[PDB]
Design a protein around this ligand. Structure first.
Ligand SMILES: *[C@@H]1O[C@H](CO)[C@@H](O[C@@H]2O[C@H](CO)[C@@H](O)[C@H](O)[C@H]2NC(C)=O)[C@H](O)[C@H]1NC(C)=O
Ligand SMILES: *[C@@H]1O[C@H](CO)[C@@H](O[C@@H]2O[C@H](CO)[C@@H](O)[C@H](O)[C@H]2NC(C)=O)[C@H](O)[C@H]1NC(C)=O
Ligand SMILES: *[C@@H]1O[C@H](CO)[C@@H](O)[C@H](O)[C@H]1NC(C)=O
Ligand SMILES: *[C@@H]1O[C@H](CO)[C@@H](O)[C@H](O)[C@H]1NC(C)=O
Ligand SMILES: *[C@@H]1O[C@H](CO)[C@@H](O)[C@H](O)[C@H]1NC(C)=O
Lengths: 50, 99, 104, 49
């Protein structure tokens, strides 16, 4: 709705900071997974003898 | 005719982004950590992977907890059987209880 | 505190924070050796007191784990527990006794 | 993306690897401690005299 957007443009930068907070959370989740699991420098593998 | 809640979430402007690391890469990281721990001990966590037999690695662990390594070397089959029984019990408890 | 075996750390101030300089120890140059869990000598199982048994192909030595410094296997760096019928992978070698040249 | 190089540890039940040299390494770790302390006057912000 164009009228709703035109009245929403008068409320300032609430949308931009909400988007910034959600983007920070989304980047932080990948940072958490990388800092938990990617702790080894080389992909080791087991010899075929067991 | 069966509408979905995810369809209403998308049509109202709510989206879920996929993660950067797929589950296959997480499984590869887990397998690399397991292979390093089994084939080298704690040596891969401080530098290059120094290989060692697993019985001597368990003797290192036994000396770490305060027990002489001849306790391990004279009870190796019993410790191996106890570990296999505990891993099978972990399997059965995951297969039975869902909480 | 760092990657490797930790030795020291030093603090430095920073704008709105702190910086730690971690001094650690890293093993460098690897070499393959033939190892055994224990040594059967005169029907007695000898275990290393602190270290491992290594072999360069012909002779057997006892070494600390984090650095290669081989020593002659004596009775002052090994201990005796049981016979050599229980341990899997035990090898046959001699164990030097320092009292034998003192008596002779 | 690549997770890293592929390595295979030469595992055996009578083979060991023992280092013969060493390296003394100094690394850096940066940690935040405090942030900026701010103060807000409501009457000056919302109204302004
Ligand atoms: C394994 O180590 C032993 C002990 O150092 C070596 O035996 C010595 O070999 C040198 C040759 O460079 C001789 O001069 C010495 O007389 C030997 N010592 C004794 C007590 O016999 C042995 O050669 C090494 N083997 C390998 C394959 O490196
Ligand atoms: C252990 O490593 C050090 C350096 O990491 C080696 O020292 C070097 O040796 C070469 C050959 O003599 C010299 O050209 C360099 O100038 C030395 N560097 C330093 C910083 O002293 C040392 O030789 C190695 N030791 C062993 C037994 O391998
Ligand atoms: C030890 O033996 C393995 C067997 O293939 C070899 O790949 C390796 O280069 C040798 N040396 C060291 C220092 O690991
Ligand atoms: C060690 O010596 C005993 C006899 O003293 C012998 O029966 C045994 O087979 C030897 N061990 C090996 C690995 O050859
Ligand atoms: C050592 O490893 C080999 C090959 O993996 C295996 O056949 C053997 O049973 C193991 N144990 C001994 C004591 O040689």
């Amino acid at each position: 709705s164009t009228e709703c957007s035109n009245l929403l443009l008068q409320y300032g930068s609430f949308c931009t900071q909400l988007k910034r907070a959600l983007t920070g959370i989304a980047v932080e989740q990948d940072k958490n997974t990388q800092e938990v699991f990617a702790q080894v420098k080389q992909i080791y593998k087991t010899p075929p003898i067991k | 005719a069966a509408r979905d809640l995810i369809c209403a979430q998308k049509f109202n402007g709510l989206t879920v982004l996929p993660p950067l690391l797929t589950d296959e890469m997480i499984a590869q990281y887990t397998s690399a950590l397991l292979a390093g721990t089994i084939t080298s001990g704690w040596t891969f966590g401080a530098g290059a992977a120094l290989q060692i037999p697993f019985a001597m690695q368990m003797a290192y662990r036994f000396n770490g907890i305060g027990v002489t390594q001849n306790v391990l070397y004279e009870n190796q089959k019993l410790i191996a059987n106890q570990f296999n029984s505990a891993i099978g019990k972990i399997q059965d408890s995951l297969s039975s209880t869902a909480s | 505190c760092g990657k490797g075996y930790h030795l020291m750390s030093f603090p430095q101030s920073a704008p709105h924070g702190v910086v730690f300089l971690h001094v650690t120890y890293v093993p460098a140059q690897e070499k393959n050796f033939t190892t055994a869990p224990a040594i059967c000598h005169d029907g007695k199982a000898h275990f290393p007191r602190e270290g491992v048994f290594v072999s360069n192909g012909t002779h057997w030595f006892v070494t600390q784990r984090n650095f290669y410094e081989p020593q002659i296997i004596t009775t002052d760096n090994t201990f005796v527990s049981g016979n050599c019928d229980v341990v899997i992978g035990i090898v046959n070698n001699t164990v030097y006794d320092p009292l034998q040249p003192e008596l002779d | 993306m690549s997770l890293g190089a592929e390595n295979s540890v030469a595992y055996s039940n009578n083979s060991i690897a023992i280092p013969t040299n060493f390296t003394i390494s100094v690394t850096t770790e940066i940690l935040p401690v405090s942030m900026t302390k701010t103060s807000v006057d409501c009457t000056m912000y919302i109204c302004g005299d």
